Design a protein around this nucleic acid. Structure first.
Ligand SMILES: [K+]
Ligand SMILES: [Mg+2]
Ligand SMILES: [Mg+2]
Ligand SMILES: [Mg+2]
Ligand SMILES: [Mg+2]
Ligand SMILES: [Zn+2]
Lengths: 44, 159, 176, 337, 138, 132
RNA sequence: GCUCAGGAAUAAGAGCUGAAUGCAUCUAAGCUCGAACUCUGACCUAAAAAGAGACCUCUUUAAGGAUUCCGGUAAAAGACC
RNA sequence: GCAGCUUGCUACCUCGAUGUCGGUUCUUUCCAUCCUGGCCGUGCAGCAGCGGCCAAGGGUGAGGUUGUUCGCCUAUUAAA
RNA sequence: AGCUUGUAGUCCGUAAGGGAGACAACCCAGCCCGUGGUUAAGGUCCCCAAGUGUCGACUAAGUGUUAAUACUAAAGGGCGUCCCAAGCCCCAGACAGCUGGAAGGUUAGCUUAGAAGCAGCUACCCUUCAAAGAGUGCGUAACAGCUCACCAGUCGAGGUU
């Protein structure tokens, strides 16, 4: 099925809404472009 | 037709409509929003342009629409008062041949504003100061000039 | 109150920190570790079982650099003293991975059914042990242990499929 | 403009396309040692082409196991003499020759190329090279060899051709010991190459003199109505308006052939000693008959007949141990038929 | 004999060019691979690969690859080298990777104002790194 | 596709009208293009034995005629060499209508087919009376 | 007929360690990976590289070169062998 | 806002002539990338898409109409 | 628009020489010949005469190293960095981490047999309590362990707008 330890590393990051870069789950700003809005990576 | 065409002020005023012919009507519908019969709003913020520019009636209407939507959504239908201070008095014209008889035909109206001149004033309660600030920030994005928000009344009531 | 930029690092007993040249060297019961820590405007002193890192100036760059250097020194003394351990988990859906150590590399065979095994590199004297269905990584250098775990986890990346269905790989469950 | 694309006419990897500066190919690179000491190169003379019927032993080939006809080039490979040992010193500015010892006794026809080195210092020259190696002044050793074409009859020349060959060994001391073993001896092609292995062939290609761009670079002819308007074998344009010049990359007439070329991965199909095995009825055309030991190279080799072909062990070979070919039939029918 | 180790490339070049134009000495520069270029590594590498790959093949600039040749070229740009004075100056300059065997053991000097320890940061690369990333064997 | 053991010159280029030698009702087909053939500037698409071509039925029945079909060339007059050095040539060019997979639309093939197509397309081999 | 790569250093990007900002953070220093790109490696050319090279041999009225002669693996004339 | 690859505007150069359009041939450059390489997101199960980032090394063809450029159409093609 | 058409001053036209890389008209300067001196504009790391000049800061982008200029990219954004100022919290212990409880409310009403706090429209929901809402999350065909907005102890200095 879905393994929680894998989902921690694969699906548990934020996504910049302007450049799609991966960001930390706690990040409020994109590291690549500095965009202020980040969405959690869609795990469904 | 970009706003950069009729943006810079290089000319004298063109406003006497009895010496011209056929000016298209302005797009800006209202100039007072929110609760027009309230004057006891303690906080009053305004949007001042910081360059000498001409603002077309469509730009004024777009800024007014966006600010009014934000204010109505956040503070409510009568939680604010909003005033568009400037009227588009200048008549914009375009040369639609070449450069022969190039004096243009009237294509719209614009407001010729000066630096530090108030464009929009918003009055709200103390708790809605940041919402009014945000709405006026969105309104200034539709204008052809850099802008800045200033607090006119109730500065001590916000900080 | 009074802002102090200098930072103090305690040297536990059995640890002989030296800072000859611009290279920091720490010796302990677990081994010896040596790192280069040079940055203009930052000064490091070793004295009486205590290293102090200070900056000549107090701008944000010097504050950041003194913090980073103090963290590096603390990690080095901890590595020579207590070391580091990193836990990784082996997960798969249909194909059992064949994971083993052949020296300084980790062999990841049958990953997602592939006929060519993957190869993750070990860094430094890092100790990788395959404890059945999980991997333990131990070493005296936090940099080396972290990079070894990162190499293991990055080598097991499913690089084209949907991550919400294909989740086979080796994942860090506890960092160094 | 919407453009139709075409790959560029010819290769700019062999520019300038000038005459080779010598009639001998010079090797710019030498492969790495993979075993016991030995010379990395040999030199023969191209005789001509024939074909053999062999069993296809190439692994994974579609025709593996069945009889195939394989064109081969026959190359006469009389024993070469190891004329000298040369030591090199590596520095920042690259290798430099530091020492040389010539063999005491050298062939009399060598005088046709150079005045013969005397039978002077060989023990002391060798001990000087040994000291230089011990003190770290030597980076590698090469062997100077020359061919002896006098034993051939299809090649009219008696003057030897001199070239440097690498020695393949695991260590510099082993190289020096092996070179001292082979110094002044006659090395056979079996002492350099084994049957069934791949080698690289270098030669000066066939000279065609001055040739036009159609033959030199393979440019298109003028087509249709343009074929008879006066510029048929000429390039369409020499350039644009700007830049105001003819680029060196524009195909133009000039020397064609007589260049140095290296071919890769040419398999040795047979090392022979009896020249009657390969010489056809009536002889090789314009050459004659093979007399000494020879070598069969699968496929074609650069150069015409009688050119010196240099053979070196492969520098970019891919396949592993190929085996000994099973040559069922060497065609000795008349090439003149 | 100037030791180029830990020296700013342009400042050493300016010093040596002025000394050569003072017209009384032959200048040798050793350890040219150890000269320093301040600035971030990405920027310096980008500018040097832009300069290296610029010109035309029949005409264009032929920017060298060896660090000693690069250093000589850097000094070359601070001289009137198309003039007799500049040609004389360039003929009296020799730049080396490492120490040539003849100059081994000779007494060297260093320009104090070209020293890289006067830089305020760590944003620098050595000339040898630039040369070897341009494909120069030395 | 799977390689043949022989070297086949691509003797037929686009526009060649080849006799169709099966019982599908196509008598003469004209090559339009060659499948799995990328060319170069100014080069017509070229087909030799074993190649599949898109064809247009020029002669034959009204039902077949003007139809774009797939055909495989099985004979060619241009000489090709077998692995053991023998060069083979036929008296004429011939093709048979097939699908993408290489299965003949007809049931019998009048005349000999080349052995190379017989191996690359086994169904053409079984359908043919004699393989040369 | 032959016509591989391998290695290095990178782009986007993915990570490690890591402070500013006790936590967290792929980044601000530092570190590991990472492309048909770049470099190296192959290959062709290259002492007219003005820092105009290295080594060896032969010989200083010589070594050796050219011309004539018989030619062709070369060749528009020259050149080359 | 960028570009200057469409069309205008303008009249600075050229009227003691800088030979027109289109095609063809040959060479080259740009990148705002069609394919090929590497990535990220997805309303990404796989197959295959859609969107975006890096990347200009190589490739980007054959035909019917039309002088065409452009465009339409045909069958191939990794893409044409 | 280095467009077109006015106006005042001044230039080029017809203006050298000095300086701006070169520059009709930009700066110094209007210039008889020769010599010496001192300056102007402009410059002083080398090219190139004179500073690797001084003091106080900023910039990390080779940004820049471009008086006027036909020869110089915007709106917008930046927890990049350096400043000034004003609010609020702060050794009656903030800010972020380390610990410890989210036990009484309600299973609040929702056609269709089923989303009974996350479709959903509304509160002086507890007497009173250091402490528990008509609800911030990967999760539920109708229920649930696992995360918060909260006061508690923790080392102990600034935090935030
Ligand atoms: K083009
Ligand atoms: Mg003036
Ligand atoms: Mg006049
Ligand atoms: Mg005047
Ligand atoms: Mg003047
Ligand atoms: Zn982003």
């Amino acid at each position: 099925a879905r393994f929680p330890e894998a989902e921690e590393r694969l699906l548990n990051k934020k996504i910049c809404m302007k450049c799609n870069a991966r960001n930390a789950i706690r990040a409020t700003r994109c590291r690549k472009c500095g965009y202020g809005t980040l969405r959690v990576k869609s795990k469904e | 037709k970009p706003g950069s065409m009729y943006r810079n002020v290089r000319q004298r005023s063109f406003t006497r409509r009895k010496y011209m012919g056929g000016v298209p009507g302005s797009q800006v519908i209202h100039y007072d929003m929110g609760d027009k019969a309230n004057t006891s709003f303690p906080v009053k913020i305004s949007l001042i342009v910081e360059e000498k520019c001409q603002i077309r009636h469509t730009a004024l209407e777009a800024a007014r629409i966006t600010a009014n939507r934000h204010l109505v959504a956040d503070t409510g239908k009568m939680g604010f008062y909003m005033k568009l201070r400037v009227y588009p008095h200048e008549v914009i014209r375009e040369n639609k041949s070449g450069m022969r008889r190039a004096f243009g035909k009237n294509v719209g109206t614009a407001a010729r504003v000066k630096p530090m001149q108030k464009i929009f004033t918003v009055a709200v309660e103390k708790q809605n100061f940041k919402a009014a600030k945000e709405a006026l920030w969105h309104a200034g994005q539709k204008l052809p000039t850099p802008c800045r928000i200033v607090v006119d009344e109730g500065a001590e009531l916000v900080q | 109150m009074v802002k102090e930029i200098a930072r103090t690092i305690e040297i536990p007993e059995g640890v002989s920190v030296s800072l000859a040249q611009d290279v920091f060297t720490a010796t302990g019961p677990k081994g010896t570790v040596e790192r280069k820590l040079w940055y203009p405007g930052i000064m490091i002193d070793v004295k009486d079982g205590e290293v102090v890192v200070d900056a000549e100036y107090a701008r944000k760059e010097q504050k950041a650099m003194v913090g980073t250097f103090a963290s590096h020194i603390r990690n080095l003394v901890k590595g020579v003293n207590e070391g580091f351990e990193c836990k990784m988990s082996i997960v798969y859906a249909h194909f059992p991975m064949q994971v083993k150590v052949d020296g300084k590399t980790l062999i990841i065979g049958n990953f997602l059914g592939e006929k060519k095994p993957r190869f993750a590199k070990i860094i430094g004297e890092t100790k990788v042990k395959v404890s059945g269905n999980d991997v333990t990584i131990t070493g005296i250098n936090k940099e080396d242990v972290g990079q070894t775990a990162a190499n293991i986890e990055q080598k097991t990346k499913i690089k084209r499929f949907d991550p919400r269905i294909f989740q086979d790989g080796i994942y860090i469950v506890q960092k160094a | 403009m919407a453009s139709i694309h075409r790959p560029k006419r010819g290769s700019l990897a062999f520019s300038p396309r000038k005459r080779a500066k010598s009639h001998i190919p010079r090797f710019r690179a030498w492969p790495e040692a993979t075993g016991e000491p030995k010379l990395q190169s040999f030199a023969g003379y191209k005789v001509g082409m024939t074909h053999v019927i062999m069993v296809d032993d190439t692994k994974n080939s579609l025709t593996q196991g069945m009889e195939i006809s394989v064109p081969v080039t026959v190359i006469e490979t009389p024993a070469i003499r190891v004329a000298a040992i040369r030591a090199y010193a590596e520095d920042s500015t690259g290798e430099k020759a530091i020492a040389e010892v010539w063999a005491a006794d050298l062939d009399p026809e060598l005088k046709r190329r150079i005045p013969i080195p005397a039978a002077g210092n060989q023990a002391e020259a060798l001990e000087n090279i040994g000291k230089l190696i011990e003190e770290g002044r030597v980076s590698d050793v090469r062997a100077v060899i020359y061919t002896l074409p006098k034993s051939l009859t299809g090649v009219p020349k008696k003057v030897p051709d001199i070239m440097e060959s690498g020695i393949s060994a695991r260590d510099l001391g082993t190289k020096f010991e092996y070179s001292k073993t082979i110094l002044g001896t006659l090395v056979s092609v079996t002492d350099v190459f084994k049957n069934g292995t791949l080698v690289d062939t270098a030669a000066i290609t066939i000279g065609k003199g001055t040739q036009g761009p159609v033959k030199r670079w393979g440019i298109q002819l003028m087509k249709g109505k343009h074929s008879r308007q006066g510029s048929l074998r000429q390039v369409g344009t020499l350039g644009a308006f700007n830049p105001s010049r003819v680029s060196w990359r524009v195909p133009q007439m000039g020397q064609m052939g007589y260049h140095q070329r290296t071919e890769f991965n040419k398999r040795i199909l047979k090392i022979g000693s009896d020249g009657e095995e390969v010489t056809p009825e009536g002889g090789f055309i314009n050459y004659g008959l093979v007399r000494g030991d020879y070598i069969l190279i699968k496929g074609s080799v650069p150069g015409p007949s009688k050119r010196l072909i240099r053979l070196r062990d492969p520098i970019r070979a891919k396949k592993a141990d190929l085996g000994e070919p099973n040559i069922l039939y060497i065609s000795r029918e008349s090439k003149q038929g | 004999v100037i030791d180029a180790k830990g020296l700013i490339l342009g400042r050493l070049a300016s010093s040596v060019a002025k000394q050569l134009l003072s017209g009384d000495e032959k200048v040798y520069i050793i350890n040219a691979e150890q000269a320093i270029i301040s600035g971030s590594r990405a920027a310096t590498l980008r500018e040097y690969r832009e300069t290296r790959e610029r010109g035309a093949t029949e005409f264009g600039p032929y920017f060298p690859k060896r660090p000693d040749r690069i250093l000589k070229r850097t000094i070359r740009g601070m001289l009137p080298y198309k003039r007799a004075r500049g040609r004389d100056a360039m003929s009296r300059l020799k730049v080396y990777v490492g120490v040539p065997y003849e100059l081994k053991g000779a007494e060297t000097v260093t320009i104090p104002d070209a020293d890289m320890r006067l830089l305020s940061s760590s944003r620098y690369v050595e000339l040898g790194e630039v040369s070897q990333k341009m494909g120069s064997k030395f | 596709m799977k390689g043949m053991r022989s070297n086949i010159p691509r003797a037929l280029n686009a526009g060649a009208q080849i006799a169709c030698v099966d019982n599908t009702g196509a008598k003469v087909v004209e090559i339009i293009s060659v499948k799995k053939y990328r060319g170069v500037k100014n080069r017509m698409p070229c087909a030799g034995i074993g190649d599949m071509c898109v064809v247009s039925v020029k002669k034959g029945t009204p039902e077949m005629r003007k139809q774009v079909l797939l055909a495989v060339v099985v004979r060619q007059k241009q000489e090709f060499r077998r692995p053991d050095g023998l060069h083979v040539s036929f008296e004429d060019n011939a093709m048979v209508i097939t699908d993408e997979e290489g299965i003949p639309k007809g049931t019998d093939i009048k005349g000999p087919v080349a052995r190379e197509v017989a191996e690359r397309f086994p169904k053409i081999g079984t359908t043919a009376s004699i393989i040369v």
